[PDB]
Amino acid sequence: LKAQTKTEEFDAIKIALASPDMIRSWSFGEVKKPETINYRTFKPERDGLFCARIFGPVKDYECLCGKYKRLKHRGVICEKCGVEVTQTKVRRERMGHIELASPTAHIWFLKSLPSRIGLLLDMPLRDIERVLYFESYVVIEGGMTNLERQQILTEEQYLDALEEFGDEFDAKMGAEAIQALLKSMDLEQECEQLREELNETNSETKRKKLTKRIKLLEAFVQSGNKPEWMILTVLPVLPPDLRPLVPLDGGRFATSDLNDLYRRVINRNNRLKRLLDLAAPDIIVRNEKRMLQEAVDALLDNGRRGRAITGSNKRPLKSLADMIKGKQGRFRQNLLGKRVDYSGRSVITVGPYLRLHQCGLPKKMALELFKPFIYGKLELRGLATTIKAAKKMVEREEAVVWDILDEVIREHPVLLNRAPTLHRLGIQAFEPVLIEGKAIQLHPLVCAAYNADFDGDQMAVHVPLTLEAQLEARALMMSTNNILSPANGEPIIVPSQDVVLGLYYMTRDCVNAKGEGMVLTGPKEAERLYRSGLASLHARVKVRITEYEKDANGELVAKTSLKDTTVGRAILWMIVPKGLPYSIVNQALGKKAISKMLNTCYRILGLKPTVIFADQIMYTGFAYAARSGASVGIDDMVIPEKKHEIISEAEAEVAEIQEQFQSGLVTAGERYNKVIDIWAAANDRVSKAMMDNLQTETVINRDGQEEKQVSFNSIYMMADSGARGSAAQIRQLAGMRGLMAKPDGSIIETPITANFREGLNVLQYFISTHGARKGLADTALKTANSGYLTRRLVDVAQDLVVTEDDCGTHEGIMMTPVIEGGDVKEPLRDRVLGRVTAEDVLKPGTADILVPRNTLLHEQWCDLLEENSVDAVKVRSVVSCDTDFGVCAHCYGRDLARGHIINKGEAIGVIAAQSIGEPGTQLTTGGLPRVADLFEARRPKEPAILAEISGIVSFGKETKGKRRLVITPVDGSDPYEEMIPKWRQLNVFEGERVERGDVISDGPEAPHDILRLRGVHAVTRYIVNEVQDVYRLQGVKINDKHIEVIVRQMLRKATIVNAGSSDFLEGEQVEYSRVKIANRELEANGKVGATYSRDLLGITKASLATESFISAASFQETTRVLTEAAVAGKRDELRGLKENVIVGRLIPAGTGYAYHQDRMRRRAAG
């Protein structure tokens, strides 16, 4: 089979240095003139930056001179001026060149931080530049006379040396010299000699640099790049249409900055050739050569010499490097953003009538959006003669088009998105419902996922054009298909505010009301009793209900009974589907409980019933909340009657301590602490006063004299249910609010005595203002911090995707309840839920296996483990996964919007980063910067030192800067002595045995240590526990998984100890290494296998290392990455997400996983 020649579907990409002949290969002509256009007839001057001959025809399929204007004549080169008549797009394609008179250095390889020409020649930068500017002479191929090869001389020195040695000695200067250097260089010889020298002398300083350099050399050799190519003989010119001269309004022209530069280069070059043909003196031609160097440099990358300015404008002209790099930090267009067709946006409204699987869309919007579909469908039925007439029809908006639109809309989903996109739920699919208006209607239950208020937030809409996109949206991005946050299995469809106030008001009981103590047959006549006004919504009543339990095998049991409940609960029970027990609705129904209802319902009945259930809950919530007549008046907020008294007493305390300071019984600062303490305590008192009052004060009579229950007051119900408001804010409404603190952070000792129900005076408000401003500023800052964090996270994970099914390793981490301090800051059941057991676990007695081997632990398994007393479960994690270059689904967990085990091919790194990043706005050393420090693995300010090795220790030597510590193992030797500064108070006992990783001092410790001394599981445990300590303290739920994948990406690199294949100290992928040692344990060398040591790299550091260079060019410094890759001739095979996103082909994950797989195996095979 003939392989191929012409266009195929390409794989990978290659990058390297450019040959003069290769540069010419791209070039379809040499631009010989600085001229652009004729100045009258705007036609291009021949052989110029803009040209028809070299590049392409001005107008489609037409010659410049105008001889052949017909679409027939195509492959024809015109006799007058050769122009092959072809599409003008080719002028966007065909490149060019310029033959430079004097050699020129490529500024990217001169000025890159590790200067390439510099370290390749083992020559310093300042020397090379000094040579390039003709400031001094440099030797080349010195031979045996007096002098080195790389040695540098001066005018007089060169003269004297030449006088002594005429031949067998060589020196040049300028660019020609550096080129001569690079060309005369023999890499192989250097390889041999350097290997020898490496082998001879023993010093660290010597063989370190030695091995680094030989590695560099042989790499550059294997690349295929020859050093000469660092010096440009020929300069390629970019196609004219990529740097357009295109005109504007008012007969004004606008052109890019590349034209100014290129024109300069051409000018100075031609002038150099001219000065050569005139036999000018040395100084002149030298000045010209230097100027040419500067011009070319400014063209390539501007700002590394002089920062040349554009014509008549101060602002420095944008060079090719800036063209590539882009702006906004690192953003390459596939990053910052890209405009997209078939889209729209607008202000959003409520639409409670909507089912949760749909949403409202404006008529006009849907018309303009689906316009092509509308055309094709209009003429498919025959209502329109041709596409033209169809346009005329929809343009006139004839009455017949609306129905056709209703046709094309029906099963066709649309994508909705908000501005602050964090987690995947930031974009969700809905079924369009045509609505009269300009506003988008969005289902209330989803308002939590978007974090969208109704205060003028806008949403954007995208149309899933291709069939695959329709099915992707419907089976993945669909609202109903994600009911559960990917961070934790808890439902994100949880009812929000009005609805929960409705369900709260419904089920609740006042002491006495209509129909108190009566009995009813079923919920039907309970509701019938209520609506007729005979019975009150809340009253204690016994009613017969039929509840189901599916506890049989796949089968619903039915039982009936007389339940003691309320009218409202009875009415609400009608909604509750099937196998849910009545108990769930027999409570007060707070936001938490109303959530657990949906949860249990989902883990029992499945998806569909949970969906319809949730919908019904929303509808009834709204309806009964409406009927409730809940409102808020000025008298709804009740101030304690004892407030003024507390104020006065706490105010007596301040004058007590004041008198004490007057008499000197107490110091100033101690006084300050005292007064601040008494005021704080006062605030606590008033708070717990108004709380009790506003809470239980309702005093009502049933058949007797008195009794008292929880208040029916509005603001209380609101705060208690969880609809909105909280004890903190309610506290500020009735009782006094806090004490404020000046910007310094010094807390003022005169708190705000008044509240919002009362008036605040001038001072109090002024003092509050700072708190407000710092609030908005801090929050607006932490949004950005969160963004940056998520960015670093996705950059470090990304391409991690579920690939293999099961790696099959018994390995895993021990899962215990968190048990911090006092009782259980988080249970065992949550930590082990949805995960998979590494190995079977026992009962108190054994040979009875509850959970066999590796099995998904769902609610039933976890409750079965809860029945038994088992406190200990070993669980498989993504950090310990044996699979290389990915995670096996059997290792990850079940967690997803769906309860089933994680799918094959879903990209977990991304979702992990998103899950860690979404709550980051809700975070307050501690705090969010603490999290950032953790993932960066930064060594703290005042750390602690763990014991290096177990065994008895003692204090060695004396005081100079350190007092040495001598460790003494039981069997093995004791060379180990660590130098610990003695001015730091120690911990370790001079006479006691210390296990490795014990406390030899206090303070936090760097996780590098924990990894090295205490182990891998130990360090991952430290990271996860500390970060979870940060989040959980704020009330944020994040499963250990995501953190664990981030951790796995942190430790991806490790440094070898032993040898037998690769280099000694190389940091490398533990995937590569483990795959190579597992392969070397058998066959190959019998066992040569090399030991490594796991390394801990920070997230921002581990993000630096990526195989694909196109990926690195995205988020890193572009200028360096391109060069540093181009020298080694690095070949990017794609294989990752980011790269395939840039190149614009199907993502090697998700749906595309069936593609890249069926490809990847076809590659490197038969």
Next chain:
Amino acid sequence: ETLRVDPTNDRLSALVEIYRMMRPGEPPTREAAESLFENLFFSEDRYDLS
């Protein structure tokens, strides 16, 4: 100690180091250093606090 770190000696020397500080790399001149230093904070033209 400030004097102990001072590389200069006389007025001309100081003016040299100053003119070479403000406009470095180009050869200094007496009239140049004088004109510069006089035109920085002492010139009614190039300076004012109002």
Next chain:
Amino acid sequence: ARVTVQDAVEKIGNRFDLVLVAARRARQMQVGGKDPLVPEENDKTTVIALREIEEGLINNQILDVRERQEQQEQEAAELQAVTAIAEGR
């Protein structure tokens, strides 16, 4: 309309391959080479395909088989046509 795809996800496990298979089938219907295997409710090919998955009458196996058969259904037609090309020798 199909509110939740959970049933289809039950018929084929992967849930991405669900999208792929249902896509391929939906294409078989959309560019008409074929007709639905189950009553069309006015549901577009998008949903019809999913209904076909849920009924367990359509998946990767079935489709591959049908297509493989059709290749020979065409081979049978062009049997006398392509063997007439013996002029190759």
Next chain:
Amino acid sequence: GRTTDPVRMYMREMGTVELLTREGEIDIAKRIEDGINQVQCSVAEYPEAITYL
């Protein structure tokens, strides 16, 4: 010495050469005359240069 920015490395490199005296100009011009007229005479001494004309 080298501050980069070739305006300097030029400005200084040319500043080395000393200005000509009014007599030195005549010296140089005389040298020019000597050289040229030499090549002209050398051209006149070639038969082919004549026959060609």
